[PDB]
Structure 1
Amino acid sequence: MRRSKAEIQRYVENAQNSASSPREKSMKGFLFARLYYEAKEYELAKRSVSSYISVQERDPKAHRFLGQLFEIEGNVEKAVGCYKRSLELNPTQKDLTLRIAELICTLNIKDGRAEYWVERASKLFPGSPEIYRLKEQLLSSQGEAGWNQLFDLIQAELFARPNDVYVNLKLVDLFLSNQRLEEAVLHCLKPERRALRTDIEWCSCVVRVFKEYLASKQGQKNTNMRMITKELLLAQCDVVFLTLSKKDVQKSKEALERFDQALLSVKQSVSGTDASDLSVTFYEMRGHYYMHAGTLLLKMAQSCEVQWKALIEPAALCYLLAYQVPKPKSKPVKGDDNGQGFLEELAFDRQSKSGHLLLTLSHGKQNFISEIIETFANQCGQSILLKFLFEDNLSMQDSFMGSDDISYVENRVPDLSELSQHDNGSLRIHNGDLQHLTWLGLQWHFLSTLPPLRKWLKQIFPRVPQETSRLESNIPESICLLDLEVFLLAVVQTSYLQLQDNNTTADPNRPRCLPLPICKQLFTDRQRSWWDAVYSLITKKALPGTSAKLRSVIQHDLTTLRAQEKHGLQPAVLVNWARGLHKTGYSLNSFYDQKEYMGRCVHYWKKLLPLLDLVKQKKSIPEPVDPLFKHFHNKDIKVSEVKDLEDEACIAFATLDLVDGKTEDAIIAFESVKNVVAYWNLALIYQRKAEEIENDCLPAEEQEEFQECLLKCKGFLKMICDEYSAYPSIATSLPVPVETVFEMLDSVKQSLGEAMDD
Structure 2
Amino acid sequence: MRRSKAEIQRYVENAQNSASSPREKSMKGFLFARLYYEAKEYELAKRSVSSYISVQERDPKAHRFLGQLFEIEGNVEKAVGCYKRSLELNPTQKDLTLRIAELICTLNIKDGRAEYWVERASKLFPGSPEIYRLKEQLLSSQGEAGWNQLFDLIQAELFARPNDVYVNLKLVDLFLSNQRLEEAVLHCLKPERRALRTDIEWCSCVVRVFKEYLASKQGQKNTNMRMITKELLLAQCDVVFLTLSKKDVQKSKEALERFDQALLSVKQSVSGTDASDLSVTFYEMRGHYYMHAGTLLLKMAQSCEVQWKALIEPAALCYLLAYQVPKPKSKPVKGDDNGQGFLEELAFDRQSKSGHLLLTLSHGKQNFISEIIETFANQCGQSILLKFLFEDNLSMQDSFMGSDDISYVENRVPDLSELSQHDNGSLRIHNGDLQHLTWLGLQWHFLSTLPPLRKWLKQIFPRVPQETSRLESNIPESICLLDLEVFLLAVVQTSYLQLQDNNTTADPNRPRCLPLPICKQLFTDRQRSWWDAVYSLITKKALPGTSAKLRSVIQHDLTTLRAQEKHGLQPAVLVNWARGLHKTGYSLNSFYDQKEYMGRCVHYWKKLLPLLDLVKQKKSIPEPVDPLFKHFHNKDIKVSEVKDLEDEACIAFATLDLVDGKTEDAIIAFESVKNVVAYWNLALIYQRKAEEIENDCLPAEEQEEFQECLLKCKGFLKMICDEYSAYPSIATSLPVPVETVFEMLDSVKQSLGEAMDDHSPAFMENHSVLTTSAIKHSTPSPTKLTISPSKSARFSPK
- When residues 432 and 14 of structure 1 are mapped into structure 2, their CA distance, relative to the original with a 3 A threshold, is farther
Instruction: Tell me the residue number matched to 1:729.
Output: 729
- When residues 379 and 493 of structure 1 are mapped into structure 2, their CA distance, relative to the original with a 3 A threshold, is same
User: Residues 385-443 of structure 1: CA distance to partner in whole angstroms, max 9, x if unpaired?
Assistant: 44554455433432334443248999988545543333222212333234333333343
Contact persistence 1:573–1:636 (CA under 8 A) = no
- When residues 283 and 73 of structure 1 are mapped into structure 2, their CA distance, relative to the original with a 3 A threshold, is same
- When residues 571 and 339 of structure 1 are mapped into structure 2, their CA distance, relative to the original with a 3 A threshold, is same
Corresponding position: 1:104 with 2:104: yes
Whole-Å separation in 1 of the counterparts to 2:573 and 2:137: 60
Whole-Å separation in 2 of the counterparts to 1:413 and 1:718: 40
- When residues 523 and 700 of structure 1 are mapped into structure 2, their CA distance, relative to the original with a 3 A threshold, is same
Greater Cα shift, 223-232 or 281-290:
223-232
Instruction: Tell me the residue number matched to 1:307.
Output: 307
- When residues 22 and 173 of structure 1 are mapped into structure 2, their CA distance, relative to the original with a 3 A threshold, is farther
- When residues 737 and 403 of structure 1 are mapped into structure 2, their CA distance, relative to the original with a 3 A threshold, is closer
Contact persistence 2:436–2:516 (CA under 8 A) = no
Structure 1 unaligned runs (5+)?
A: none
- When residues 301 and 575 of structure 1 are mapped into structure 2, their CA distance, relative to the original with a 3 A threshold, is closer
Cα offset, 1:684, TM superposition = 4.0
Contact persistence 2:490–2:629 (CA under 8 A) = no
Whole-Å separation in 1 of the counterparts to 2:227 and 2:201: 21
Contact persistence 1:467–1:592 (CA under 8 A) = no
Whole-Å separation in 2 of the counterparts to 1:250 and 1:347: 27
User: Residues 2-46 of structure 1: CA distance to partner in whole angstroms, max 9, x if unpaired?
Assistant: 988789889989999999999999888777766665554545655
Contact persistence 1:466–1:481 (CA under 8 A) = yes
Contact persistence 1:327–1:347 (CA under 8 A) = yes
User: Residues 721-746 of structure 1: CA distance to partner in whole angstroms, max 9, x if unpaired?
Assistant: 99999999999999899999999999
Cα offset, 1:600, TM superposition = 0.7
- When residues 108 and 348 of structure 1 are mapped into structure 2, their CA distance, relative to the original with a 3 A threshold, is same
User: Residues 212-234 of structure 1: CA distance to partner in whole angstroms, max 9, x if unpaired?
Assistant: 33222223344544454344334
Contact persistence 1:260–1:399 (CA under 8 A) = yes
Cα offset, 1:543, TM superposition = 9.3
- When residues 274 and 147 of structure 1 are mapped into structure 2, their CA distance, relative to the original with a 3 A threshold, is farther
Contact persistence 1:261–1:399 (CA under 8 A) = yes
Cα offset, 1:280, TM superposition = 3.6
Whole-Å separation in 2 of the counterparts to 1:393 and 1:724: 64
- When residues 464 and 397 of structure 1 are mapped into structure 2, their CA distance, relative to the original with a 3 A threshold, is same
Whole-Å separation in 2 of the counterparts to 1:190 and 1:588: 44
Instruction: Tell me the residue number matched to 2:149.
Output: 149
Instruction: Tell me the residue number matched to 2:200.
Output: 200
- When residues 309 and 601 of structure 1 are mapped into structure 2, their CA distance, relative to the original with a 3 A threshold, is same
Whole-Å separation in 1 of the counterparts to 2:200 and 2:540: 37
- When residues 644 and 731 of structure 1 are mapped into structure 2, their CA distance, relative to the original with a 3 A threshold, is farther
Contact persistence 1:641–1:733 (CA under 8 A) = no
Contact persistence 1:472–1:478 (CA under 8 A) = no
Contact persistence 2:377–2:409 (CA under 8 A) = no
Whole-Å separation in 1 of the counterparts to 2:730 and 2:405: 63
The secondary structure found in structure 2 opposite 1:640 is coil
Contact persistence 1:581–1:598 (CA under 8 A) = yes
User: Residues 72-106 of structure 1: CA distance to partner in whole angstroms, max 9, x if unpaired?
Assistant: 34665555555666677777776555444344345
1:644-659, aligned counterparts within 5 Å?
A: 645-659=645-659
The secondary structure found in structure 1 opposite 2:374 is helix
- When residues 89 and 481 of structure 1 are mapped into structure 2, their CA distance, relative to the original with a 3 A threshold, is closer
- When residues 228 and 9 of structure 1 are mapped into structure 2, their CA distance, relative to the original with a 3 A threshold, is farther
User: Residues 686-707 of structure 1: CA distance to partner in whole angstroms, max 9, x if unpaired?
Assistant: 3432332244765565566667
Whole-Å separation in 2 of the counterparts to 1:469 and 1:484: 16
Contact persistence 1:71–1:79 (CA under 8 A) = yes
Contact persistence 2:105–2:114 (CA under 8 A) = no
- When residues 341 and 358 of structure 1 are mapped into structure 2, their CA distance, relative to the original with a 3 A threshold, is same
Cα offset, 1:462, TM superposition = 0.9
Instruction: Tell me the residue number matched to 2:449.
Output: 449
Larger helix proportion, structure 1 or 2?
A: 1
Contact persistence 2:581–2:597 (CA under 8 A) = yes
Cα offset, 1:260, TM superposition = 1.7
Contact persistence 2:572–2:635 (CA under 8 A) = yes
Whole-Å separation in 1 of the counterparts to 2:295 and 2:277: 26
Give the structure, 1 or 2, with the largest relative contact order (CA under 8 Å, sep 6 or more): 1
- When residues 17 and 553 of structure 1 are mapped into structure 2, their CA distance, relative to the original with a 3 A threshold, is farther
Contact persistence 2:203–2:235 (CA under 8 A) = yes
Greater Cα shift, 551-560 or 598-607:
551-560
Contact persistence 2:287–2:321 (CA under 8 A) = yes
- When residues 409 and 210 of structure 1 are mapped into structure 2, their CA distance, relative to the original with a 3 A threshold, is farther
- When residues 69 and 513 of structure 1 are mapped into structure 2, their CA distance, relative to the original with a 3 A threshold, is same
- When residues 653 and 358 of structure 1 are mapped into structure 2, their CA distance, relative to the original with a 3 A threshold, is closer
Contact persistence 2:319–2:354 (CA under 8 A) = yes
Whole-Å separation in 1 of the counterparts to 2:674 and 2:374: 67
Instruction: Tell me the residue number matched to 2:353.
Output: 353
Greater Cα shift, 725-734 or 605-614:
725-734
User: Residues 535-592 of structure 1: CA distance to partner in whole angstroms, max 9, x if unpaired?
Assistant: 4565677799977765653454344444578777653453354345445545765411
Whole-Å separation in 2 of the counterparts to 1:431 and 1:750: 54
Whole-Å separation in 2 of the counterparts to 1:231 and 1:459: 28
Cα offset, 1:598, TM superposition = 1.7
Cα offset, 1:523, TM superposition = 0.8
Whole-Å separation in 1 of the counterparts to 2:675 and 2:367: 53
Instruction: Tell me the residue number matched to 1:167.
Output: 167
Whole-Å separation in 2 of the counterparts to 1:725 and 1:585: 30
Cα offset, 1:755, TM superposition = 12
Greater Cα shift, 173-182 or 597-606:
173-182
User: Residues 632-667 of structure 1: CA distance to partner in whole angstroms, max 9, x if unpaired?
Assistant: 665333324545544544443344334334334444
Contact persistence 2:253–2:296 (CA under 8 A) = yes
- When residues 521 and 583 of structure 1 are mapped into structure 2, their CA distance, relative to the original with a 3 A threshold, is closer
Whole-Å separation in 1 of the counterparts to 2:620 and 2:149: 68
- When residues 170 and 28 of structure 1 are mapped into structure 2, their CA distance, relative to the original with a 3 A threshold, is farther
Instruction: Tell me the residue number matched to 1:396.
Output: 396
Contact persistence 1:624–1:630 (CA under 8 A) = no
User: Residues 506-557 of structure 1: CA distance to partner in whole angstroms, max 9, x if unpaired?
Assistant: 8351234321232111211111222234445656777999777656534543
The secondary structure found in structure 2 opposite 1:449 is coil
Contact persistence 1:64–1:99 (CA under 8 A) = no
Cα offset, 1:275, TM superposition = 5.6
Instruction: Tell me the residue number matched to 1:490.
Output: 490
Whole-Å separation in 2 of the counterparts to 1:252 and 1:274: 32
Greater Cα shift, 415-424 or 2-11:
2-11
- When residues 364 and 143 of structure 1 are mapped into structure 2, their CA distance, relative to the original with a 3 A threshold, is same
Contact persistence 2:671–2:679 (CA under 8 A) = yes
- When residues 34 and 670 of structure 1 are mapped into structure 2, their CA distance, relative to the original with a 3 A threshold, is same
Whole-Å separation in 2 of the counterparts to 1:664 and 1:745: 23
Contact persistence 1:3–1:39 (CA under 8 A) = yes
Greater Cα shift, 539-548 or 96-105:
539-548
- When residues 591 and 404 of structure 1 are mapped into structure 2, their CA distance, relative to the original with a 3 A threshold, is same
Contact persistence 1:16–1:25 (CA under 8 A) = yes
Corresponding position: 1:554 with 2:534: no
Cα offset, 1:71, TM superposition = 3.2
Contact persistence 1:470–1:477 (CA under 8 A) = no
Whole-Å separation in 1 of the counterparts to 2:652 and 2:681: 10
Instruction: Tell me the residue number matched to 1:516.
Output: 516
Contact persistence 1:453–1:485 (CA under 8 A) = yes
Greater Cα shift, 514-523 or 491-500:
491-500
Instruction: Tell me the residue number matched to 1:622.
Output: 622
Whole-Å separation in 2 of the counterparts to 1:719 and 1:376: 55
Whole-Å separation in 1 of the counterparts to 2:733 and 2:416: 35
Cα offset, 1:630, TM superposition = 5.5
TM, length-normalised to structure 2 = 0.75
Cα offset, 1:594, TM superposition = 1.5
- Counting matched residue pairs gives 758
- When residues 92 and 598 of structure 1 are mapped into structure 2, their CA distance, relative to the original with a 3 A threshold, is closer
The secondary structure found in structure 1 opposite 2:756 is coil
Please give the root-mean-square deviation of Cα atoms over the aligned residues, in Å. Answer: 5.6
User: Residues 363-405 of structure 1: CA distance to partner in whole angstroms, max 9, x if unpaired?
Assistant: 8999999999999996566455445544554334323344432
Cα offset, 1:295, TM superposition = 2.4
Greater Cα shift, 587-596 or 25-34:
25-34
The secondary structure found in structure 2 opposite 1:598 is helix
